[PDB]
Amino acid sequence: FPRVKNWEVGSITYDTLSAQAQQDGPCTPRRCLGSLVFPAPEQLLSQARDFINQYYSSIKRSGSQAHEQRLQEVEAEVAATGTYQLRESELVFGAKQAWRNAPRCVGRIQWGKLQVFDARDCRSAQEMFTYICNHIKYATNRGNLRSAITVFPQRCPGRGDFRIWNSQLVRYAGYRQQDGSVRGDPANVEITELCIQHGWTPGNGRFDVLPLLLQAPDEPPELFLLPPELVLEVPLEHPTLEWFAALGLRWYALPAVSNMLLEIGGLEFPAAPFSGWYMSTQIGTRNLCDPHRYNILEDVAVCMDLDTRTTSSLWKDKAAVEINVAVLHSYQLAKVTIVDHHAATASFMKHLENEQKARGGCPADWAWIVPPISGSLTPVFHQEMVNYFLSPAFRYQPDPW
Amino acid sequence: KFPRVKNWEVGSITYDTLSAQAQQDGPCTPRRCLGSLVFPPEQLLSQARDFINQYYSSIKRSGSQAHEQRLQEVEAEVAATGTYQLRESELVFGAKQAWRNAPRCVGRIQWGKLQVFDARDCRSAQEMFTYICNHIKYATNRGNLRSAITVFPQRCPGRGDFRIWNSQLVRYAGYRQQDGSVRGDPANVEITELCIQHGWTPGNGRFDVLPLLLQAPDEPPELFLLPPELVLEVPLEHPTLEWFAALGLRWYALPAVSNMLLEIGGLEFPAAPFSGWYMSTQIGTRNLCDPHRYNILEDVAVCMDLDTRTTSSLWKDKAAVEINVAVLHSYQLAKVTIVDHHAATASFMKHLENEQKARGGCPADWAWIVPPISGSLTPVFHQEMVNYFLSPAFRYQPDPW
Numbered sequence: 001f002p003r004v005k006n007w008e009v010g011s012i013t014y015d016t017l018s019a020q021a022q023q024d025g026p027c028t029p030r031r032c033l034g035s036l037v038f039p040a041p042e043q044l045l046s047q048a049r050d051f052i053n054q055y056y057s058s059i060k061r062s063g064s065q066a067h068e069q070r071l072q073e074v075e076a077e078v079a080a081t082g083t084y085q086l087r088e089s090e091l092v093f094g095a096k097q098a099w100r101n102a103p104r105c106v107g108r109i110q111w112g113k114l115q116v117f118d119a120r121d122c123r124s125a126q127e128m129f130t131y132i133c134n135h136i137k138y139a140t141n142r143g144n145l146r147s148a149i150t151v152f153p154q155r156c157p158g159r160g161d162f163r164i165w166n167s168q169l170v171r172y173a174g175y176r177q178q179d180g181s182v183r184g185d186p187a188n189v190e191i192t193e194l195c196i197q198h199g200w201t202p203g204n205g206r207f208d209v210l211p212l213l214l215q216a217p218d219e220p221p222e223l224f225l226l227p228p229e230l231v232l233e234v235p236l237e238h239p240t241l242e243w244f245a246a247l248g249l250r251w252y253a254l255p256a257v258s259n260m261l262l263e264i265g266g267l268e269f270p271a272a273p274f275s276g277w278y279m280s281t282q283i284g285t286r287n288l289c290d291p292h293r294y295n296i297l298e299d300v301a302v303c304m305d306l307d308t309r310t311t312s313s314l315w316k317d318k319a320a321v322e323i324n325v326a327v328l329h330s331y332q333l334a335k336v337t338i339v340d341h342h343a344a345t346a347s348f349m350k351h352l353e354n355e356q357k358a359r360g361g362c363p364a365d366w367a368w369i370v371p372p373i374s375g376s377l378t379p380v381f382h383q384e385m386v387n388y389f390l391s392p393a394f395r396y397q398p399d400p401w
Numbered sequence: 402k403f404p405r406v407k408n409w410e411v412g413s414i415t416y417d418t419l420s421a422q423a424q425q426d427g428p429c430t431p432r433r434c435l436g437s438l439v440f441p442p443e444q445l446l447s448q449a450r451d452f453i454n455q456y457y458s459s460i461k462r463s464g465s466q467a468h469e470q471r472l473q474e475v476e477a478e479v480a481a482t483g484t485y486q487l488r489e490s491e492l493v494f495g496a497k498q499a500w501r502n503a504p505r506c507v508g509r510i511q512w513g514k515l516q517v518f519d520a521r522d523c524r525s526a527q528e529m530f531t532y533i534c535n536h537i538k539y540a541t542n543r544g545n546l547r548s549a550i551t552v553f554p555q556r557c558p559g560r561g562d563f564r565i566w567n568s569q570l571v572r573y574a575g576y577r578q579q580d581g582s583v584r585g586d587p588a589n590v591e592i593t594e595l596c597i598q599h600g601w602t603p604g605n606g607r608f609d610v611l612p613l614l615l616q617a618p619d620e621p622p623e624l625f626l627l628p629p630e631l632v633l634e635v636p637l638e639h640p641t642l643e644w645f646a647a648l649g650l651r652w653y654a655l656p657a658v659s660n661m662l663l664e665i666g667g668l669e670f671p672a673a674p675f676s677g678w679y680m681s682t683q684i685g686t687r688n689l690c691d692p693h694r695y696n697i698l699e700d701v702a703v704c705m706d707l708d709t710r711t712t713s714s715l716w717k718d719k720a721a722v723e724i725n726v727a728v729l730h731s732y733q734l735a736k737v738t739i740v741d742h743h744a745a746t747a748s749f750m751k752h753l754e755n756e757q758k759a760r761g762g763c764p765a766d767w768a769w770i771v772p773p774i775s776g777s778l779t780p781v782f783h784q785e786m787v788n789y790f791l792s793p794a795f796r797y798q799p800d801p802w
């Protein structure tokens with residue numbers, strides 16, 4: 001049982017939950033690969049049985065008649081059909097637990113407050129589109145964002161998967177350029193190229209919202225345009241740098257990850273988009289300042305009249321701080337939910353304490369929890385963490401193309 | 402079986418083939434990653450043959466006259482006496498390798514330039530003091546810092562060891578009060594308590610340089626007042642915030658780690674103080690702003706008239722950047738070598754590239770290479786890394802009590 005120290009306070013805890021880690025990660029006693037971004041009815045029965053056990057523990061009915069009856073129903077369904085169906089309440093519990101178990105999520109204090117939309121009866125790409133529009137609308141809630149997930153039908157033998165080809169429901173186009181550069185978000189070049197290939201007439205601005213490419217089973221993807229009035233956006237200004245508005249920068253309200261696989265009790269849902277609300281460093285530091293994204297840092301630091309010829313002036317650090325101030329202020333001004341990296345990491349420390357009492361530990365990926373500016377200024381930096389895989393889970397999956 | 406390692410800024414891929422040599426098994430398993438934790442008789446001949454082979458490979462002299470001969474005498478030495486003495490050049494070559502293998506050192510671009518002071522003929526805390534005093538004055542060099550390591554006698558069975566009871570050669574005192582809390586450095590409250598207990602006059606200051614506690618084999622320690630003209634210190638001022646100097650802050654010139662255990666070819670040196678020069682975040686962000694260190698962050702924000710009532714003003718981030726600006730400006734004005742975190746991480750990326758060609762990879766600890774401020778603004782944030790233990794190495798060791 002790993003002992004875990006907080007260095008700011010001196011406290012010490014042991015992670016007993018890690019002992020229950022189901023799947024395996026990329027590290028060995030030889031070598032740690034923690035910093036890497038990307039690390040049969042009987043085994044289906046085994047995962048199912050474990051999840052049903054989890055479910056009946058949560059409702060204080062472990063070992064009950066209804067518990068044994070459900071184990072039997074699942075075994076019989078897996079024997080007759082090679083798969084099984086989740087009850088509605090098992091689905092809700094399973095989606096919340098997947099969030100709870102996500103080691104790279106700093107927002108998990110909120111895990112119990114999740115709106116689960118059961119789209120497991122979805123029939124086509126066209127119905128998928130309507131469900132997704134309802135998700136964006138409910139989650140955005142006119143700027144008072146609400147956490148939600150929409151669960152589309154599970155993977156099942158004899159039929160292809162539902163897939164959302166887009167990595168998030170709202171993303172900006174990235175157009176490869178005349179002179180080899182990228183106009184717009186360079187992270188989205190490939191999906192942008194796929195949209196045009198599938199009939200989209202491109203724009204040529206830097207913040208053009210992409211269409212949705214939605215795949216129903218055994219069907220090519222289908223293009224759907226998001227209704228403009230469903231996509232709430234925030235123009236970026238700075239509270240005291242008035243030329244900052246003239247950069248023409250914007251970002252969208254809703255972060256809705258749409259390319260990850262939800263696993264519950266051995267069942268796999270390849271289409272199950274989820275959304276919370278932004279932490280300011282995602283927009284301010286990563287999306288805008290990463291050299292391979294919008295890469296605005298030097299341009300802002302010149303406008304700030306910082307001395308960009310020497311690194312020891314800390315011009316990068318000064319420009320980045322003001323970009324993050326601009327993001328926070330603009331979202332507050334527009335009345336769109338946002339959390340700064342200090343508030344978020346402080347709430348995550350409370351989550352770690354809740355989870356130590358409840359489950360004896362908490363899976364956490366230190367390199368993802370610690371914000372990408374002002375790391376040691378936040379309490380998570382001084383907190384040792386144990387990273388491991390629990391199920392239910394959100395997993396990465398390969399791109400459909 | 403050779404980890405694929407990606408840089409996400411550029412898209413470039415390499416394979417760490419050097420990882421195949423990792424000896425001292427780390428703390429990670431396929432079940433859980435512990436990469437964020439701070440602290441995780443003729444076996445001597447095996448690590449001797451291994452290290453000697455390392456020596457002769459490095460000079461294009463494997464499988465040649467001189468190579469065999471040195472294999473024999475270490476075998477004879479350990480047969481006749483149970484251990485062996487290192488050749489002068491091997492001690493030099495081993496010191497540089499243990500540096501080059503330190504996964505947590507961002508400074509390793511400098512690893513080939515190292516001055517090795519051979520103190521193996523030492524005996525007693527009076528001799529130690531002069532050797533340490535030679536090191537300090539040499540390494541400081543009037544502020545033109547030079548990397549240096551002083552190797553005190555190797556450990557042998559049946560007789561006590563050489564140890565420096567201080568974690569560094571220059572540390573500041575930490576004094577409790579009528580209420581537990583500390584004037585001075587809270588990281589050194591313990592050794593301050595030991596020094597005062599061992600016959601030292603406590604100061605009344607937040608920046609009193611502690612005395613050395615030097616221990617010869619099987620004998621108690623002895624206190625040694627460090628020659629004040631040998632302890633180069635830098636008063637901290639800001640280039641434009643005129644009141645910053647009035648805060649009365651200072652830091653010392655020389656970072657001289659004196660509690661680690663140099664291990665070469667199976668031999669163990671529990672007293673082998675090494676020293677390089679500071680990266681400015683070490684002082685300005687960790688030493689001054691950590692909540693459990695000098696904890697000055699809010700005092701500086703009051704002085705800057707920042708709104709400390711809301712976390713979303715990023716008042717912590719702004720105060721922190723200016724504290725780091727003051728450190729860099731102050732050391733440069735005093736003409737004491739120092740490197741900012743942008744220049745240091747840039748040079749590390751160059752080191753990674755060099756080590757890729759030279760040895761097929763480099764052991765790096767992502768959580769320690771990435772600076773404690775502005776992490777994703779430096780190139781190392783976007784570089785995946787493999788951590789593993791190679792020998793020769795610096796290792797941690799328990800306090801001598």
Ligand code: HEM
Nearest residue numbers: 099102104105106107110147148274275276277278279394
């Ligand atoms: C309520 C507010 C929420 C906040 C503030 C938040 C915060 C974050 C942040 C900052 C990241 C790192 C993302 C990145 O750097 O790309 C992250 C990752 C993640 N979050 Fe949360 N999150 C929230 C809600 C949710 C919800 C509702 C779910 C699912 C039900 C979820 C599941 C995940 C997962 C699976 C990841 C890993 C995704 C990846 O590796 O790219 N989060 N979260």
Ligand code: HEM
Nearest residue numbers: 500503505506507508511548550675676677678679680795
């Ligand atoms: C010359 C310029 C150097 C720079 C700029 C530099 C920078 C750093 C930094 C910032 C750390 C992190 C330590 C911490 O956060 O407490 C570190 C760790 C370390 N360095 Fe270097 N260093 C230098 C020279 C050296 C030398 C000369 C040696 C040994 C010969 C060395 C070996 C190590 C070791 C063993 C650690 C790990 C210390 C620990 O875990 O407590 N470095 N270095």
Ligand SMILES: C[C@H](O)[C@H](O)[C@H]1CNc2nc(N)[nH]c(=O)c2N1
Nearest residue numbers: 035036037367368782783784785
């Ligand atoms: C190489 C490194 O793993 C990579 O840059 C990671 C580091 N930490 C991160 N942390 C978060 N929250 N999001 C990220 O995309 C990353 N990227």
Ligand SMILES: C[C@H](O)[C@H](O)[C@H]1CNc2nc(N)[nH]c(=O)c2N1
Nearest residue numbers: 381382383384437438439768769
């Ligand atoms: C908990 C965590 O491992 C701890 O705070 C580490 C993180 N990374 C670090 N990195 C460096 N260079 N120095 C440190 O002291 C630490 N502290």
Ligand SMILES: [Cl-]
Nearest residue numbers: 255282283287
């Ligand atoms: Cl995003």
Ligand SMILES: [Cl-]
Nearest residue numbers: 656683684688
């Ligand atoms: Cl230090």
Ligand SMILES: [Gd]
Nearest residue numbers: 239240241242
């Ligand atoms: Gd202004």
Ligand SMILES: [Gd]
Nearest residue numbers: 246247299303
């Ligand atoms: Gd411009």
Ligand SMILES: [Gd]
Nearest residue numbers: 644703704706
């Ligand atoms: Gd004033």
Ligand SMILES: [Zn+2]
Nearest residue numbers: 027032429434
């Ligand atoms: Zn690991």
